[model samples]
Target: AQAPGQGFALLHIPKLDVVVPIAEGISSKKVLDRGMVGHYAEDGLKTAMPDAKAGNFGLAGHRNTHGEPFRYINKLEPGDPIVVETQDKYFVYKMASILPVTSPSNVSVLDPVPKQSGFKGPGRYITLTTCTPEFTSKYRMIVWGKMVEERPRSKGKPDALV
Candidate 1:
């Protein structure tokens, strides 16, 4: 029940000191340009919600402008935490791999088991996408993570958030 500009979750990346609202769709005017992370939940780009049993939860954010929530994602290393906070749960993922540069048409990075992501098979995963090479949209940078924990809000905040 998400609208284009309405936020439904918060994306927390402690290493980069980022906490941004997450909304549906990657539209520049409606989502990214508003300084919110956008979930790939529309049509062909549709991805799973964090609560899903097994699927990639793909996300997009600005790298150098509009709050630049993912500006420092390249600095992230394996084992770093990428937590998504929803109304009911906190989905915690650990950085697993990175694709420094890729063609914008290479949608494989958003696949359920992303290519070049070092993942052997289907499982709960997360993909962070942003433009590469600073202020240009010439290329894309990808960061992949695997779900490590799914803690319900009723239980309490996860370690990543505490």
Candidate 2:
């Protein structure tokens, strides 16, 4: 079910009018740069799946080129909708916080309960990572969201989408 470079889900950010493929790895050459949002699910960077009861579903995308799917994510405000659609269900999250600038090595940002995410404890959450300051990779821009709805496909799209 996991194929390299193959999209397993659709990531939709309503505020940014973004609808992109969510693929397997964060590799720029194999995933991100190819116009797909990469999941943090490799080696030491592995993260929780969207359906997990508790954990962070981390994702990475380009902010400048090759589709630049996250170029305007910085404009997202609290309460914005971030939806992930799989074959069986739609996982909807509400934007909660933003870390406008951070070090690239700040892997803690992907922790189950991200230290800087303003979350009091562990729960279903998401972390979006993109290069900061526009066209450069000197820093990182982070966005965090909390899962608010998990509706089965049989029930139709969630309110966030409709």
Candidate 3:
């Protein structure tokens, strides 16, 4: 359970005009069922934090249902913006590459330094994953991005927050 005032996060994709609340903890039916994306944590099938400075901040969301925030993620092109806002910071990332189809075994995409995701070295990044072809859990689609700017929440929201 979260402490008072330590709630959830918001994932905003300006290009797609979508804003979704991100629930804590990953791979939970109850969480996703409640219309929120799950943030992969540090212990199991782990994901990096935006404040970590150099790692892939992973997020999994439903593509066909349960808010379907990433349903149109395939339409995202290079240079598109994705913003994740926590209680204290706004992390901005720019779309860099798309993996149309990949093996579910390709867990390297969630690595601290993702391999084959258009990133040349260790750096802050965001990796979005969802099922492909719609309504099916066959192959996976991945969108990779590099964090460009991180503004303190005290500074106000970023322009691409949507």
Candidate 4:
């Protein structure tokens, strides 16, 4: 557990007082024309470890309708802290960049440096994508965050879970 992005932690905001595991597909952006809080895409509904085969962490959600999780993502300013943790670890990634990327860019940024071609290397990055123009489900929102530090599980999931 001393390597790069190894485990998943609960992502949270003390002010909002919301805490949830860094589940693969749980970071939803909208309430689909389908199911509950986040059930549109199966990709965003996974709870696999962070250090798994997937290169970068891609978070997707609806542009409008369902839950609109990523709708206010753009509101996150630089230096805004995003934290991740596991049973024994806590990794924090600072907001580095947020921009609009054409759909299917595949240039995952959740890792270290997008590492060309995508799907390899060993740098942990956070690449978030969502629809654009509020209710327009047309474009995507890609926010790149990089790990800056880690805390021991002895820390117990950022205290957001408590």
How well does each candidate superpose onto the true structure, as a TM-score? Answer: 0.96, 0.96, 0.89, 0.60
Q: What's the CA error at residue 31 for candidate 4, in Å? A: 10
Give a tens-digit lDDT track for model 3, residues 1-162: 100112288889987878888876654465655667777664556777889967888887788887788888899988898999888999999998988888766778888878778677888999888887789877788889988889999999777763
Q: What does candidate 4's lDDT look like per residue over 1-162, in tens digits?
A: 000111234555343333443332333232223222221124332322345433355554445554444556677767677665556677666666777645544433333445332334555566666667676755666666656666677755543334
TM-score of candidate 2 relative to the true fold: 0.96
Candidate 4 residues lying further than 4 Å off, grouped into runs, are 1-9, 13-18, 24-55, 63-66, 104-112, 115-122, 156-162
How do the residues 109-143 of candidate 1 rate in per-residue lDDT, one tens digit apiece?
88899888989998999999999889988899999
Per-residue error for 6 in candidate 4, Å, reads 18
Stretch of 10 with least lDDT, candidate 2: 1-10
Go through the candidates in order and give each one's C-alpha lDDT: 0.90, 0.90, 0.79, 0.49
lDDT, model 2, position 114 = 91
Q: Which digits, one per residue and each the tens of the lDDT, describe model 2 over residues 37-138? A: 999887788999989899999999999898889999889999999999999999999999999998898898999999798899989999999988888888
Residue 132 CA error for candidate 2 (Å)? 0.8
Give candidate 2 misplaced runs (Cα > 4 Å): 1-3
